[PDB]
Write a protein that binds this DNA or RNA. Sequence first.
RNA 1: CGCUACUACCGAUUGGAUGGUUUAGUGAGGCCCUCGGAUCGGCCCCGCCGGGGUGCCCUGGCGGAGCGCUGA
RNA 2: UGGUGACUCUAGAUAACCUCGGGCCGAUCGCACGCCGGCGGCGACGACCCAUUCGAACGUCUGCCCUAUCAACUUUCGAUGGUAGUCGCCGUGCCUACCAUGGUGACCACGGGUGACGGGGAAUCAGGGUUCGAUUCCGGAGAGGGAGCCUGAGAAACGGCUACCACAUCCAAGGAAGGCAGCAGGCGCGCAAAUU
RNA 3: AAACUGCGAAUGGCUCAUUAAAUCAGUUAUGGUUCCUUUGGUCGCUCGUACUUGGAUAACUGUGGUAAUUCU
Lengths: 151, 262, 50, 205
Amino acid sequence: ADIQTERAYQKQPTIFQNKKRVLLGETGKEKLPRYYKNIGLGFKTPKEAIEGTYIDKKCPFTGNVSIRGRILSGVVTKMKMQRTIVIRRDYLHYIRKYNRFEKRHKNMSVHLSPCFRDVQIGDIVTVGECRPLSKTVRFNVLKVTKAAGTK
Amino acid sequence: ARGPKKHLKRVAAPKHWMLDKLTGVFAPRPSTGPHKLRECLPLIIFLRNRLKYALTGDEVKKICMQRFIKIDGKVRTDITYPAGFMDVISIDKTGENFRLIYDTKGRFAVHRITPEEAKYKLCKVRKIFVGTKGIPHLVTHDARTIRYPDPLIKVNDTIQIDLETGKITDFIKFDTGNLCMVTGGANLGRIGVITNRERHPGSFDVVHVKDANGNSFATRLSNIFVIGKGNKPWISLPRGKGIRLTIAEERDKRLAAKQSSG
Amino acid sequence: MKLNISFPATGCQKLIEVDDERKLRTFYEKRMATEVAADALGEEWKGYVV
Amino acid sequence: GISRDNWHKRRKTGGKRKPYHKKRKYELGRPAANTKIGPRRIHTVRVRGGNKKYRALRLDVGNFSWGSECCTRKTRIIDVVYNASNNELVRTKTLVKNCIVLIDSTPYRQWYESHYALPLGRKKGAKLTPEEEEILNKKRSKKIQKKYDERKKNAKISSLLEEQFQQGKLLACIASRPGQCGRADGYVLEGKELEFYLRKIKARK
RNA sequence: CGCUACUACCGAUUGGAUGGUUUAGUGAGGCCCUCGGAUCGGCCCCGCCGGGGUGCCCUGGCGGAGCGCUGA
RNA sequence: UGGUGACUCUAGAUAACCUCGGGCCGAUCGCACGCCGGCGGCGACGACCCAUUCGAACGUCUGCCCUAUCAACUUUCGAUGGUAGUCGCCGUGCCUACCAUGGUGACCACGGGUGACGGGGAAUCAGGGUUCGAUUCCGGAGAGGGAGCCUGAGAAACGGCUACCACAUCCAAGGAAGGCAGCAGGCGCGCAAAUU
RNA sequence: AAACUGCGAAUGGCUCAUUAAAUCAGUUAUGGUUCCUUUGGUCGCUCGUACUUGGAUAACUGUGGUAAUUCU
């Protein structure tokens, strides 16, 4: 697919893609190295990140974002922006006078890289905290676990 | 507030200074220096409250301005100078030397050391980095920078600085079986052998320490200071050797001392 | 309008009181730092420029 | 004045946020440095901490790099032809980061010809003047001519860059922020990026 | 249904007051940008024995009565 | 080279650039001192930069009183996100241009009220709880109300400046000057609070 | 003494008007920034009048203006 759907050229800023080509420099292939990094904390770089072609500067694996801070989990509830999803974290808040709990939830707008295709509503996502990416986004989707019902 | 603060309230001061709640509204705000505000001991507190060499801050000022106090071998005339862990305070007029070392209660002790021990100190290396044509540099807990350190010295180790020259003479690795003091937290002032280190990536590592009396405790890796190689300290320890007694044992010792004394 | 006249070659100065506007229609409508002949003040001022 | 705060912004729920303090100095903004092309005019700005920002107001020279040949040269900026953010920036000819410009190819061609024995361009196909054959052919020894011939084999230029050199101007992208550092530096467009920006410039006419 | 008194409503009509919010017009004053150039200097230059061209004759401060360049 | 869980880190190499408003690489000062001229101790001060010392700033997670006689709000003039930039000390719809149609809500959004600064904490209390917290500690805000700035490392400072609105002082009417929610003190207000 | 210069005057003190995920508390992050001062390190690392360069301006002397100011 064409990765150049923007008014400006999309590229990985750390990759030089027009190193000089000559007869010896080209033998039936142009070649294009792919910048990717191994984020920490045991998270493995998805295969599509390594062998993909998308340009996403907020992607944890091939972009310019450092995963540091809280590592949370949520359930995907809305996928209707570009490269951003809304997940819902459900918890119980303890009211002490009644010695009981009440259901509460918080929505979280988190960045989803193009490396995670086939993400559905109800999927569980492990997200990691990064620097502010937009007005409301501060977490990047690190891992996707499909909801029970995969067959 | 605009700009930095320049005052410290008496009640908001660090508790281990052991200041009253009636001898004024303010506590001496320690100057910026090699040690943090809440982990230091100002020179006025040491000279007046601890050693009783002065009865007022004016007398501390007189003592310090007569150039009688050396801190790590250098004369300090700043009465709010932040003196901290492992530092050496020399008073050549009275011919004494002290090391700033925590009690088991978490308070800096009046720990007199020999004039030959006052020639060196121990520093925990806070970071190591290569700069400017590949010269290695090391930064310790005294905020002092040492160029060309041994390529075996890493973060969390301990190095013995010669105060006269400022150069490294020896070093202790951070490893199990090594003696260490605790320099923060609930176990502050305790001494023991490192038994384990739980690595928590992206968070604080936890180090387990076993006392000389079989007691065990844990701290954060930033609260550990390697004191000696093996179970032999490289510095003289205070009266209590880092053994935190329970309240019952302390009461029993106090009662025995009362019986022996009166 | 009085005149605070200063001779810098000897560092002297004096406050003249001029009340005749005929003696003054030589400085009027002239901005600062403008060199004007002082001949309109009196016979003694002939040749002076201030 | 110009404020970069967030409490004037609506909440993410759509709620309206009331102001609890007046504007702070550290939240300020400044008027844009509309860096036009012209004789060098740069104004120094005192910024937070006492440091200096170089608010360039006019520039006509930049340190642009030919990446494939690794040839960085100081070069006159002729024009600005494409701007991805706003089209009005090309109309007013404002130098900003990532704006496509036409720069002068002369220093690059001089280095190009000092690393001699490439395919013919304007070397002898558009200009045959003297005073430059003593830097093209000269009187070379065995070692020197052998080294130049060893350069010759791996000495080629993409046809797009070739016609750009023929026309006297090169397409470049400004990789520095002239309104902050005072320099309009960048790199010559090549490869697929050059094709992309040529197609974008063509589609604008 | 008559006496007597206090609240409250709708309030006949809107005389009432520290009031707020707003479309449109105007808009002080800073800051920035593009200009402006009162004025003040420095070089080249007609100059004066307190001025290297030594049959003393002439850098540098000036005493050296152009605005041509240049800086603030 | 070295380091981190993780760098587009650190260090290294190359080609060039290097701001009229222009970056550092010392025309500074004291005390003790001795040769044919040389050398030199201990200081003071100052300047780039690297080190989180004191911080500040901006983010993460969770937690706040009453109200539905407030049920849909935001999206025009940024509302949610994407791309490029501008500005900023920096991350960021922070602000522009283009693009997508998003974002929040009965798990109470949005609006309204609060005799609401928040917390440490206080009174009362069998176990639960109820009520309070302007008030000496920590954090925030303000200096009559708004707004805009200079200087500076740090202020949108008010025992700084500039203007407007309200109030108000002196004047020879031309002009000049102001800011006690600092300590005392006065008036007013009041049930309600001290020494110029 | 005065004055120029340097530093502080952004701390402290007062008050609780605003303020309802705002502030604030605990937790965490800056690998997204700045940081006077202190402390330690760096400070012949640059191949291109020096046994010390220039112009002012206060304080001071002197003449003043305004009814009036920490005006000048």
